[model samples]
Target: LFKTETLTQNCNEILKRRRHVLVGISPFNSRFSEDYIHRLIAWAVREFQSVSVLLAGKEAANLLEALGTPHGKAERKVRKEVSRNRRFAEKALEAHGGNPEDIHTFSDFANQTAYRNLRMEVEAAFFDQTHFRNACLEMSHAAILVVEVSADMLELAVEYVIAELPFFIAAPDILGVEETLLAYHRPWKLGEQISRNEFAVKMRPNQGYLMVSEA
Candidate 1:
């Protein structure tokens, strides 16, 4: 069974090193709140030595385009939404006495070696039908609608999974998260929906918390 004690101990060990956390904020679908961001930032800053907020930007725009939004319009929409969310996150970070530069959009890392390596890894995984289905299932659980596994969906999942795999593997050495990755989000069914034994670190408001499952 999954144990918070185990995860907590893992986090404590990482704390002794250069701990890095990558907090994900979606560009579409669910809504985000400033207060929630504040608490999340507060907790991360209190616990980890480094924190970086990654918001879906360029890749999300591709999803919008595949769904028939005009290319230019999709880009603008993603940009605007990401900026709004970034403002809230940055505001919270500043209020909590953290650096505002810590937040970044997905596009910011698109050209980086770390992102390319992770992207290739995810692409290879999707080559297996089972792995593809598992990723689709995880996507369905997150969205309000159950999207069919189509070409567009595949494209979306590739982008989505690439962004998410970092949490499972921790930010690559290039990103400088020397320890483990801290998934400071809602606790999902461990070893079930996610198909991995992600350890629980801590819980927060609205059923959210910290979790980590190292690759």
Candidate 2:
């Protein structure tokens, strides 16, 4: 029996509140936010059930892979959920009269009707966030889901925020992230929380420095 409370608390709260996943954006490269998230995730593994991280580009991906694979560890278990979901998106595309290959014409199909309700699926039905829908197009679903967004995929996070996927966001400092007056608490845009990255990226993630009640 493992015992991880804070993360579990965050998870439970997210489920209860119907929120999206929390992310930590680093204004100071890795030393600022990435390092801390990496360190914490590493530490959390012992206390928690699992830990997973998703990133946009290569540098972050390489860093995270190096960070996650670990040294002399028991060789972590990896499960990427991308197969059945292909059908999920396929069904969505066909049902929506969309060509899955086309982002503009196809991405418009952004709702549960096109995702879960349309067929026998395994999406978070409670998870209203179609943001992950795009990712589901190519990404994999793991136990403890950590994520990153790329330049071309900036506009997607809005729906992620709208769905409230119950993620834990990282921030620069206390001034970085905050919650809203709603069920899903989002990170304030302090480079980490609510950011504007080259207009290519919008809305980074952030969190308070403590046991935040979430918004």
Number of the top candidate by TM-score? 1
lDDT of 2 by residue, 24-58 (tens): 22211322233343333333333223222222211
Candidate lDDT (C-alpha), each: 0.56, 0.27
- Candidate 1 residue-wise lDDT, 1-215, digit = tens: 11222234444455455466566677664435766667777766776676778676566765676566787998899889888889988998888778899876655666778666765665565465565556544653353134344655555545654455434443543355445444544444432333332222112111112453222
Q: In candidate 1, which residue pairs get closer than 3 Å at backbone N, Cα or C atoms, i.e. clash?
A: none
Compute the lDDT of residue 56 as modeled in candidate 2.
21
- After TM-score superposition, the amount by which residue 151's alpha carbon in candidate 1 deviates from its true location, in angstroms, is 6.5
Q: How many collisions per candidate? A: 0, 22
